[PDB]
Paper text:
Radial spokes (RS) transmit mechanochemical signals between the central pair (CP) and axonemal dynein arms to coordinate ciliary motility. The RS is a macromolecular machinery consisting of more than twenty subunits. In this work, we reconstitute a mouse RS head-neck complex and determine its near atomic resolution cryo-EM structures in both monomer and dimer forms. Our cryo-EM analysis on the reconstituted mouse RS head-neck complex revealed the presence of both monomer and dimer forms.
We then determined the cryo-EM maps of the RS head-neck monomer and dimer at the consensus resolution of 3.28 Å and 3.57 Å, respectively. Furthermore, we conduced focused refinement on individual portions of the two maps, with the core region of the monomer reached 3.14 Å resolution, and the central bridge as well as the head regions of the dimer reached 3.36/3.46 Å resolution, respectively. In the monomer structure, the head portion consists of a compact body and two extending [name] arms, made up of two copies of [name]/[name]/[name], with the composition and conformation resembling that of the previous mouse RS head core structure. [name] is attached to one side of the head and is intimately associated and stabilized by the neck subunits [name] and [name], as well as the head subunits [name] and [name]’. The [name] N-terminal Dpy-30 motif extends to attach underneath the head subunit [name] through rich H-bonds/salt-bridges and also clip the neck subunit [name]. Indeed, the Dpy-30 motifs from not only the head subunits [name] and [name]’ but also the neck subunits [name] and [name] wrap around the long α-helix of [name], so that [name] intimately engages the head and the neck subunits. The RS head-neck is as well connected with the arch bridge through an intense H-bond/salt-bridge interaction network between [name] and [name] and H-bond interactions between [name] and [name]. The I139Yfs*8 mutation of [name] truncate its C-terminus, which is responsible for its binding to [name] to stabilize the head-neck complex, and may therefore induce instability of the complex.
Residue numbers in the entry:
A (entry chain A): 1 to 46
B (entry chain H): 1 to 113, 133 to 193, 212 to 276
C (entry chain G): 615 to 665
D (entry chain D): 285 to 330
E (entry chain B): 136 to 316
F (entry chain S): 206 to 261, 271 to 291, 310 to 377
G (entry chain E): 5 to 205
H (entry chain G): 206 to 261, 273 to 291
The structure:
């Protein structure tokens, strides 16, 4: 199923991204969500 | 060296003795205040002097927030008019290898071996900065953001590990930098001390003319190169 | 050079780096500080062995 | 259809649990701050 | 389906350098549901300019208004034109600086005082000879890329040489020795 | 006690001018990552936990030193020799050293270039409460300004 | 609010462009009274940035002269934390209309550093929600208490973010690209409901 | 919750055999060295204070020797 | 309209001299230059070709000496 695919793909990274979205509330949470997805890429790759 | 060490007149006290004048001390103080004003550098250091034949070269460097960033070095002749040198490439680095001769002055000078004088100055500056620039242990802190910052809780180097030689790094891209014990050839640094244990003097021998002062108990460090402007490959014959 | 009326002429040998001589010219002093080596425009060629 | 039953409510539950963990870390840090300030007040004045 | 409007809007060079938010009024030709006013409830739309956009990026307000029998109108609020800056004129990832010069001063170790868009007084020397068709490379500064704000572009310094017109023939007689020899 | 508690927390919520992070939120993320996964050596992993937390139109202000660097630009662009007198100052443990007396000598040069002065020697200094006084004797040629 | 937690409230202190050159003396006043400096920002308030900052007052009251006044110079913004910060900041600050406040409250900040209504000495937040909105607009990503734990943040995501996240994750399943962080980031920067489409050339 | 407060306090109170100190007293001493009136940039130095509290003559005698040799210059 | 471009050097540019703009029909003439040449400047010569026009292209030197430079400064910047 696609639910297991989204389980194994992001999980805790998307959980933490939405956690700081719920913690820090910018003018556009979508742009901050994408910027923290890029930052989480740069964390988990390097 | 920063302008704070220009205030204490520490180039002569290092013992190299080529030194600086109160002419040039006041001129570097006011003009590097101008360099920090016009160009938004985090820190501005008087890099040193390149010995001339008709005019004297005065070199200073500016740094961004990242301490390992490519510097925007500057040159001046009358010690007030600072002008931005271009960055150096490898194509200009192997270009100036066919010119062997003293630094003259008057930066529009042309070498018949054309090849401009400013290109020689910039490539020589990048060669000295890549080879014999010096940072002590714990002076630079590698931040996890990806940039390098000045370690502001830097306690100075204790007297046990002054003479190893494994406590001095390079001020370029690589305790996260490359040490002095891997320099080619070995023993190419003049290890010295001043009166007492108040200052540690390091003189480069691959480039005769750079001096590194370091007070072992305070946060005082910096490199000044005043000298010929030539890389002697005669150094294995000397040792 | 800024105030040239009370300047002193600073000699600067390029054959011996670190060698200087000085004016006012009524009296003079000589000073050297360096590595004690004669500058060569080329690299230091070693002296040839005898034939 | 599958996301509204699957990955999204589990993502909200994990986000609520992560914010609970961040809240409990913040309040044990505040408890450490309170203990440090109370001990400094009771010790420096005596 | 009606074609959308394409408003040519001017932004300054420093605004494209820094990326300032702009407030733009719009047209009022959208009928409301009450059939009494033609004014949309969103009078000013909130935008965000990224630093270093191109001259003519298309910003589309997709499905704005959503009113009509078979027409879904859109608003192209950005046709990025640039004002006539007195110092720099831009290009794709580049800035050329046109700076006037005298002929007796062009030939020197020159002093080009470049006041950039970051209010920085750049001092760039010229030590090569100055052609009429001459430019230089000053890397590391310009408007930044739209994908990388942090890494910058290039500066090119062009020269407008003004020949003198009031030379009495003594300087022409010794200008025969000042250029020909 | 509560006033000191809020003062200590405002100390810990203060944002650094170098990294742009607060100490309270950094220690909160450190304690959250500690309480998430718990190893045996809790003290010795405080380096890597704090390092791993750190992975995740502002004007520029003019100094007064910028203003005095503006005023001291023109110093570098019939006097007596002030410099040998300044060398003889220092043997008495007296005077401005070299840099401040050389800026005095440059201001003397600008004063002599501005006014028709026959003799412009350094009279000395008068110490003040908020600002200094730099005094120069001036002898005019024609007696005018 | 409860016993093992604490409530360190915040307020915004605004330094108007007429008085930014006298910043050290008023800084001595606000530090000596008990207010603490969290972070100070030297910001040039744009005319197109002042209106979104003042949707609460300028959006219903016609006053463009103050909007032109905030763009006439630099503006210093600071975050303050104090026991009863709102009440003590209103007591030290005093009421507005500084022509009347020069006679009613002679020890206030507006009586010394102010001239009139529109050329005000300072500006301070009134309510806690207004303080939160002012701090969230001017300042970067800082945390303002209370943290909305429980169902407060879940409703915020479920009516502000998660529709867009559901539409993003619906298209992310078909097809499946490798390293889907690229696809999610490009979808969020591309199919943004609050940001328009961008087309570079 | 208060049960989570007690569980996290018991987790912070757990000591380590490789150091002899727990995380709670280590962070308490770190906060003790923090809460004196340092300028507000301790975010970069919160590590270095932890090494400073975790850490807590013969190499200097050459300076004494040259000071022995130097005192006859003016006597 | 018939026109050509002559690559006059900078040495003969700022000094009054004679230039040789030879026409393509009847072998004439040695017209001298009187005013100081500009990069955007032209002369007018009567004839048929529709009159003849001369554009001047300036050729700059490449290498110079410091004394040569200083006496050029006394030539031009004074």
């Amino acid at each position: 199923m696609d639910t297991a695919y989204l389980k194994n793909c992001f999980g805790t990274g998307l959980t933490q991204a939405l956690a700081e979205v719920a913690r820090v509330r910018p003018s556009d949470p979508i742009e901050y969500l994408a910027h923290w997805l890029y930052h989480y890429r740069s964390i988990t790759v390097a | 060296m920063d302008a704070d060490s220009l205030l204490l007149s520490l180039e002569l006290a290092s013992g190299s003795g080529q030194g600086l004048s109160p002419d040039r001390r006041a001129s570097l103080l006011t003009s590097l205040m101008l360099v920090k004003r016009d160009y938004r550098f985090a820190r501005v250091l008087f890099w040193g002097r390149i010995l001339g034949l008709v005019a004297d070269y005065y070199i200073a460097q500016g740094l961004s927030e990242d301490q390992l960033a490519p510097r925007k070095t500057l040159y001046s002749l009358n010690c007030t008019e600072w002008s931005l040198l271009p960055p150096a490439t490898e194509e200009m680095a192997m270009q100036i290898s066919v010119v062997s001769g003293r630094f003259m002055g008057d930066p529009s000078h042309e070498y018949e071996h054309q090849i401009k004088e400013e290109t020689r100055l910039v490539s020589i500056i990048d060669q000295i900065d890549k080879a014999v620039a010096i940072i002590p242990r714990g002076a630079l802190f590698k931040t996890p953001f990806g940039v390098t910052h000045v370690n502001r809780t830097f306690e100075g180097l204790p007297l046990s590990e002054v003479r190893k030689l494994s406590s001095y790094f390079h001020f370029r891209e690589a305790d996260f930098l490359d040490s002095l014990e891997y320099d080619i050839p070995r023993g190419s640094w003049s290890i010295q001390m001043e009166r007492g244990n108040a200052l540690v003097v390091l003189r480069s021998l691959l480039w005769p003319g750079l001096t590194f002062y370091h007070a072992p108990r305070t946060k005082n460090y910096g490199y000044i190169y005043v000298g010929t402007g030539e890389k002697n490959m005669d150094l294995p014959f000397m040792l | 050079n800024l105030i040239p009326q009370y300047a002193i002429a600073v000699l600067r040998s390029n054959l011996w780096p670190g060698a200087y001589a000085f004016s006012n010219g009524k009296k003079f002093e000589n000073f050297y500080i360096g590595w004690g080596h004669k500058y060569c425009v080329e690299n230091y060629t070693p002296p040839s062995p005898p034939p | 259809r599958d996301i509204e039953v699957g990955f999204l409510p589990w993502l909200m539950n994990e986000v609520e649990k992560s914010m609970e963990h961040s809240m409990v870390g913040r309040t044990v840090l505040d408890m450490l701050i309170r203990d440090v300030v109370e001990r400094r007040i009771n010790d420096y004045e005596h | 389906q009606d074609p959308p409007i394409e408003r040519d809007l001017y932004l300054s060079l420093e605004d494209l350098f820094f990326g300032c938010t702009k407030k733009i009024k719009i047209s009022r030709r959208v009928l409301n549901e009450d059939r009494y006013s033609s004014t949309i409830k969103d009078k000013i739309l909130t935008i965000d300019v990224r630093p270093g956009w191109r001259q003519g990026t298309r910003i589309t307000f997709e499905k704005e208004g959503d009113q009509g029998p078979n027409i879904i109108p859109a608003d192209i609020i950005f046709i990025v034109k640039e004002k006539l800056h007195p110092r720099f004129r831009r290009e794709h990832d580049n800035l050329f600086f046109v700076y006037p010069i005298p002929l007796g001063k062009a030939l020197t170790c020159c002093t080009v005082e470049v006041k950039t868009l970051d209010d920085r007084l750049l001092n760039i020397p010229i030590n090569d000879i100055v052609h009429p068709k001459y430019f230089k490379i000053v890397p590391g500064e310009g408007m930044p890329l739209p994908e990388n704000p942090s890494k910058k572009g290039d500066l090119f310094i062009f020269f407008d040489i003004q020949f003198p017109t009031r030379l009495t023939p003594q300087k022409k007689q010794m200008l025969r020795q000042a250029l020909l020899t | 006690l509560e006033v000191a508690i809020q003062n200590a927390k405002a100390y810990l919520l203060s944002t650094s001018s170098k990294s742009g992070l607060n100490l309270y939120d950094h220690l909160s993320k450190v304690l959250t990552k500690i309480l998430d996964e718990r190893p045996a050596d809790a003290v010795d992993i405080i380096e890597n936990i704090s390092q791993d937390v750190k992975m995740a139109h502002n004007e520029y202000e003019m100094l007064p030193a910028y203003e005095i660097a503006e005023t001291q630009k023109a110093l570098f662009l019939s006097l007596p020799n002030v410099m040998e007198s300044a060398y003889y100052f220092e043997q008495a443990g007296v005077g401005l050293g070299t840099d401040e007396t050389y800026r005095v000598f440059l201001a003397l040069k600008q004063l002599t270039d501005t006014h028709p002065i026959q003799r412009c020697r350094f009279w000395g200094k008068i110490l003040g409460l908020e600002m200094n006084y730099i005094v120069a004797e001036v002898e005019f040629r024609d007696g005018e300004d | 609010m409860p016993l093992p937690q604490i409530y360190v409230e915040k307020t915004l202190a605004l330094i108007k462009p007429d008085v930014v050159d006298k910043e050290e003396e008023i800084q001595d006043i606000i530090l000596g009274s008990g207010f603490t400096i969290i972070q100070r920002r030297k910001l040039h308030l744009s005319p197109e940035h002042c209106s979104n900052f003042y949707v609460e007052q300028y959006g219903k009251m016609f006053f463009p002269n103050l909007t032109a006044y905030m763009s006439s110079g630099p503006l210093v913004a600071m975050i303050l934390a104090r026991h009863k910060a709102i009440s003590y900041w209103k007591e030290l600050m005093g009421p507005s209309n500084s022509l009347v406040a020069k006679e009613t409250h002679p020890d206030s900040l507006r009586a010394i550093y102010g001239t009139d209504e529109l050329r005000n000495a300072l500006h301070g937040s009134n309510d806690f929600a207004a303080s939160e909105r002012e701090i969230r607009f001017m300042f970067p990503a800082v945390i303002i208490e209370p943290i909305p734990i429980g169902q407060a943040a879940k409703d915020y995501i479920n009516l502000y973010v998660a529709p867009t996240l559901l539409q993003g994750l619906t298209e992310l399943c078909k097809e499946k690209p490798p390293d889907p962080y690229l696809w999610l980031a490009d979808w969020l920067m591309k199919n943004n409901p609050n940001k328009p489409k961008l087309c570079h050339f």
